[PDB]
Amino acid sequence: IETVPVKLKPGMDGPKVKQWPLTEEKIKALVEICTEMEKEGKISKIGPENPYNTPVFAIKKKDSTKWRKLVDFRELNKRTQDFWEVQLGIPHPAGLKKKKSVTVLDVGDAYFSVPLDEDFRKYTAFTIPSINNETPGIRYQYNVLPQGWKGSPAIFQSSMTKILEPFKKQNPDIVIYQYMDDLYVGSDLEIGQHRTKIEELRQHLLRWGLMGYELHPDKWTVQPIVLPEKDSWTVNDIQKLVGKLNWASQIYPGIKVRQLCKLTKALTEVIPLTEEAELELAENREILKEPVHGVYYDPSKDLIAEIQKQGQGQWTYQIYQEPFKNLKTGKYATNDVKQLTEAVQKITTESIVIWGKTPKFKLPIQKETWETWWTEYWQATWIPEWEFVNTPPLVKLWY
């Protein structure tokens, strides 16, 4: 078919990101895949006359044995933004988050059938490195739509529509959403019916060639800030209480602490339970239980996720656009990095179902540690933006 012309955001040049070193097994994996992708003409060797580069990695399918190739196009996506976001954007259905069940299906292999504009191929160069830099390093570029690029779904959008048309027309209440490599399919059917409907959809996909991992959005609720229920209340326990309440005052308007804040003693000293205090305490937690009034999602602003390590396999997180004005909060529960990588994929996935975009992550870990190990447990086909933070003593707060 006729290729669609692609342009970079004027003023921006192609990606020139260095290739992070890989372990032996991942390198062997990569040359086998690339060798096979070459015979099939999906990618072709290139020389030094190509100044661009994008890093590549090798992940395990869906916890199986087959090594899948993963390319980090975060840079190229950013330099192609208006093309795939505005020029050929894909609307995100508000209904999806409501659906009782959502199945995620990988339709990535479908992109290797459409060719890429010859004038854009150079920007997709990548390098398979070698152990101890003993051999120069194999370089390639794509000839067809690559997988981790957001331009791929935008272009292939035309075909996906014809392929899904029949199934759509026959099942008017099933929601289908596409997001860079995956198809989100939601229904309110009883699981059996749902699972059956997914199978039927795969059969359509089987033609064209181009239970599957299920989510339950409707059963997703916020993680409230908690206040002890106690029954003792030491001087310490109520100082911690007044502190946490002090926080929830710059957020969650209405949180009153005054009739409690006024309760040089020893920390050990226990103290009587106040009248209205009981009332206030109760009224405070009455809030903090329901969304911060006034906070709304701004489609033109970035979403960012912050994660705190609550120790003992417990991780809390918040999603917000402006600090402390939480759109959503939650929890997650043996390598710290393995759990963290797990939490990041869960949060991104929920984030895609709900807003249709990935959040930028503030990760409580050392850069070098994350970069050395995240691919080791990663299993999604997308890669979110991330920065490394030093968690303030805001872990006690829980949000």
Residue set of the binding site for Mg(2+): 106, 181-182
Length of the chain: 399
Work out how close the CB of 72 gets to another protein at its nearest, in angstroms, rounded to a whole number.
16
State the sign of the Cα–Cα–Cα–Cα dihedral 147, 153, 157, 160: positive
Candidates 295, 316, 317; CA nearest to 305 is 317
Cβ neighbours of residue 259 under 8 Å, at least 6 residues apart?
274, 276, 277, 279, 280
Work out how close the CB of 105 gets to another protein at its nearest, in angstroms, rounded to a whole number.
31
Work out how close the CB of 378 gets to another protein at its nearest, in angstroms, rounded to a whole number.
14
Work out how close the CB of 309 gets to another protein at its nearest, in angstroms, rounded to a whole number.
5
Cβ neighbours of residue 355 under 8 Å, at least 6 residues apart?
92, 297, 303
Q: Which is nearer to another protein, 96 or 307 (CB)?
A: 307
Q: Which is nearer to another protein, 152 or 308 (CB)?
A: 308
Q: Which is nearer to another protein, 159 or 391 (CB)?
A: 391
Report strand pairing: 386-388 vs 360-363: parallel
Q: Which is nearer to another protein, 48 or 272 (CB)?
A: 48
Task: Return d(Cα 240, Cα 235) in angstroms, integer.
Answer: 9
- From the number of C-beta atoms within 10 Å of its C-beta (0-12, 13-18, 19+), residue 51 rates as exposed
Work out how close the CB of 284 gets to another protein at its nearest, in angstroms, rounded to a whole number.
16
The one-character DSSP state at 54 is B
Binding site, residues? 106, 181-182
Amino acid at 389: V
* Phi-psi domain of 327 (left: phi exceeds 0; alpha: psi -120 through 50; beta: other): alpha
Work out how close the CB of 115 gets to another protein at its nearest, in angstroms, rounded to a whole number.
21
Two tokens, residue 69 = 């190739």
Q: Which residues of the shown chain bind another protein in the complex (CB under 8 A)?
A: 18-19, 21-24, 27, 47-53, 125, 127, 129, 131-137, 139, 234-236, 239-240, 242-243, 246, 261-268, 308-309, 311-312, 335-340, 363-366, 368-369, 372-373, 390-393, 395
Task: Return d(Cα 105, Cα 71) in angstroms, integer.
Answer: 19
Cβ 309 vs Cβ 336: under 8 Å? yes
Q: Which is nearer to another protein, 51 or 95 (CB)?
A: 51
Q: Which is nearer to another protein, 7 or 62 (CB)?
A: 7
Coil/strand/helix, residue 15: coil
- From the number of C-beta atoms within 10 Å of its C-beta (0-12, 13-18, 19+), residue 116 rates as buried
Work out how close the CB of 207 gets to another protein at its nearest, in angstroms, rounded to a whole number.
41
Q: Which is nearer to another protein, 41 or 137 (CB)?
A: 137
